[PDB]
């Protein structure tokens, strides 16, 4: 009933800006089986540094508004960077099933934060094929959320025993993308940064 006569704001008195710029314009991004996680802490998080980058294919925020991110404080900030195809961008979401979500990068169901994905054909394609980007397509079980698997063990698909040599039914789990500029936009390379709060 008694109305407030004044509004006070008490934030900590630090002036260091958060290094979102170093996440977003790194020269080499990681593969999706070995994605890069950077901890962001003890800084002022200005989110307009993200907005002066490329027109994004996806800027989808879950559990938070994208226009209110300058008004909030966060406990633990993580930035996860990798490179995927264009038809797997929707698979970086809560409650998804496929190859990137099941075997490479799993998001939790109770996920808060943003998924920012932009086209990077200019940076990560070669005309003969860019074979430096890999994904895992063979694994015994689905991944837990935020579990990284960097194993290169030779996977057996038959009833025969397998002794580390890729022979009749023995396959390596890592398949390359082979990115080309002659591909369509669903097979072109896309750089994904996932901000987790």
């Amino acid at each position: 009933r008694v109305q407030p006569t004044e509004s006070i704001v008490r934030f900590p008195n630090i002036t260091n800006l958060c290094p979102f710029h170093e996440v977003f314009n790194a020269t080499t991004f990681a593969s999706v089986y070995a994605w890069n996680r950077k901890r962001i802490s003890n800084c002022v998080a200005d989110y307009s540094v993200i907005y002066n980058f490329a027109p994004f294919f996806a800027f989808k925020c879950y559990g938070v508004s994208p226009t209110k991110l300058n008004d909030l404080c966060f406990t633990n900030v993580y930035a996860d960077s990798f490179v995927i195809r264009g038809n797997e961008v929707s698979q970086i979401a809560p409650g998804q099933t496929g190859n990137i979500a099941d075997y490479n990068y799993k998001l939790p169901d109770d996920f808060t934060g943003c998924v920012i994905a932009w086209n990077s054909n200019k940076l990560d394609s070669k005309p003969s094929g860019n074979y430096n980007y890999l994904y895992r397509f063979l694994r015994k079980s689905k991944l837990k959320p935020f579990e990284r698997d960097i194993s290169t063990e030779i996977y057996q698909v038959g009833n025969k025993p397998c002794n580390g040599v890729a022979g009749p039914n023995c396959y390596s789990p890592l398949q390359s993308y082979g990115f080309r500029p002659t591909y369509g936009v669903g097979h072109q390379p896309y750089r994904v940064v996932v901000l987790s709060f």
Partner: antibody
Amino acid sequence: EVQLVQSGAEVKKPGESLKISCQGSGYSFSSFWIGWVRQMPGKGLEWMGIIYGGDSDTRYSPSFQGQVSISADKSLSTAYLQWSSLKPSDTAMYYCARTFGTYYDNTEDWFFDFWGHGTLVTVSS
Amino acid sequence: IQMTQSPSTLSASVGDRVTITCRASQRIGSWVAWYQQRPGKAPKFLIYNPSTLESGVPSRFSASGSGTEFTLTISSLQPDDFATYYCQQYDAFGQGTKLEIKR
């Protein structure tokens, strides 16, 4: 079939302005670079500059920076080469061409696989 | 980077093997691009990597290259193969090697 169609031949007075178009068809224009190559009469090919069709990222040669301007319109799937003030040493055949290479490595695959037919620009009083 | 073609004008007849050479100033990558320009026509791209043109139809043009010396070899010459040839990597074009018929 990947095709590049340029504008017609130009006869200009010195001091005038000129813009030259290059329209691409048969390919995704936003996934490739378009470069401009001049050829003086009786002379060889000279690299002038490249532009990427997606976000208009432009690299110029150091012998052509400030003399020319290279632009692109990805909605019309075209690229432009433009002078501000024309000189009589700009009498040349100008080719647009399609290329794609590594961004941070200049020594990997920066080849012009498809070429335009060329425009002829003559400047004389 | 400066690229210099070692024959300036070469003479050959119809049906021979022609080797032309392009050398760089500094060290560049594994291959260079080769172009053929008839007089009055646009340049036509011939070869960068010989593994790219490994289709069912065999290729008339072959190419070899170290870090400095590069070589384009035409195994058999048609009358349409007497033109001006250029080597290029990124922004450096070599000066042209012109093939003339020999009589």
